[PDB]
Design a protein around this ligand. Structure first.
Ligand SMILES: Nc1ncnc2c1ncn2[C@@H]1O[C@H](COP(=O)(O)OP(=O)(O)OC[C@H]2O[C@H](O)[C@H](O)[C@@H]2O)[C@@H](O)[C@H]1O
Ligand SMILES: Nc1ncnc2c1ncn2[C@@H]1O[C@H](COP(=O)(O)OP(=O)(O)OC[C@H]2O[C@H](O)[C@H](O)[C@@H]2O)[C@@H](O)[C@H]1O
Lengths: 187, 187
């Protein structure tokens, strides 16, 4: 395969649309920052989820706390730690990589890294807490559709059932986006 | 929330970019056809996966057979059955709904319905067959990152472990896209 020519069609707030000519096929790509999400498991197997309105679907979806990697030069897990704090007011002593997902492989370069945070502490001073098994059932029942939440929930479930293990923070993130950040079309 | 005004920024081959003013915030949306994917489980718990090049990431990813809902007026499962046939040369007697996922909730209206096909028959006349547990381990190991594949693989795994059940074809698909299809910007 080979990119013959790239042409920027639009640069927006959180993404840019680009069209390339490949190997020859037209391939439009949505350049994204990439994002991080957190499955914060407490000492009793419960994780917090937020209920956020998504204009794309015109309704509120149940999701894991998450945020865009829109801070040039900021380490993903630091981005993640801030989001966990800002979103559900929790600080965690242990951080590991749970699952990375390529959200829309067909038209965007967005990739999302999902962390597993443990050893939680309520700091500072709508959302809900769900036992992992319950969250897993909400997924297979279609009550949780956000793709990032699906991946994180089912993954931590696989971990809690002993089927799988969390991974090291330094695990390589193969498809971490870079293009849109490279643009820095701001200021 | 409320959409004040919509403005089309671009209409491409498989999607359109639109920008709306909300409740007041700018919200750019990628209108998509929606797609369907298939977890085809054989009589021994193995499922077929394809290894397809994704220009967005510049590499080949392991995925479930899948296709866009680009056939105006075609039922999703029929779309799905054609793809299973065309992709891995299999016909299945039983079709159920496994999991629906909203791929990129933050910038696209794309939603994907994942079916579970059983009672397989090799018809007609690269890909590979993976025992479900192995596929599940490839996910938690980061060897399977496609979000649709992650959802389908972990979901069928939850089903094979007895934790969850498949659902009826008539299960409601809450976020099935309609906007881009409504455009019919062709011919
Ligand atoms: N389509 C959009 N157009 C313009 N601005 C947008 C759009 N979508 C979100 N924004 C904005 O970016 C900011 C939201 O930032 P975050 O809270 O960091 O992230 P979030 O939108 O929740 O997304 C995290 C992740 O979840 C979603 O599933 C999304 O696909 C993404 O990977 C919002 O306040 C707003 O400025
Ligand atoms: N970014 C693109 N720009 C222009 N055309 C594209 C693009 N991406 C794919 N196409 C095309 O659409 C056709 C592919 O159709 P399908 O085989 O029906 O579907 P597919 O691309 O595999 O996607 C199915 C699903 O998987 C992906 O994860 C993608 O996010 C989507 O939901 C290709 O032959 C080609 O015309």
């Amino acid at each position: 395969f080979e990119t013959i020519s790239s042409e920027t069609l639009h640069t927006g707030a959180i993404f840019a649309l680009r069209r390339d000519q490949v190997r020859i096929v037209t391939r439009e790509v949505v350049e994204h920052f990439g994002a991080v999400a957190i499955v914060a498991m407490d000492d009793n197997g419960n994780i917090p989820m937020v209920y956020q309105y998504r204009h794309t679907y015109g309704r509120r979806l149940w999701e894991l706390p998450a945020g865009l990697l829109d801070v040039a030069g900021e380490p993903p897990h630091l981005t993640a730690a801030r989001e966990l704090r800002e979103e559900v007011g929790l600080q965690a002593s242990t951080w590991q990589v749970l699952v990375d997902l390529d959200t829309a492989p067909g038209f965007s370069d967005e990739s999302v890294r999902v962390y597993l945070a443990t050893g939680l502490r309520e700091v500072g001073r709508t959302m809900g807490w769900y036992p992992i098994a319950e969250a897993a059932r909400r997924v297979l029942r279609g009550e949780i559709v956000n793709s990032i939440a699906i991946a994180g929930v089912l993954a931590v479930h696989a971990v809690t059932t002993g089927f799988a293990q969390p991974r090291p923070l330094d695990t390589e993130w193969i498809d971490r986006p870079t293009a849109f950040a490279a643009r820095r079309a701001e200021r």
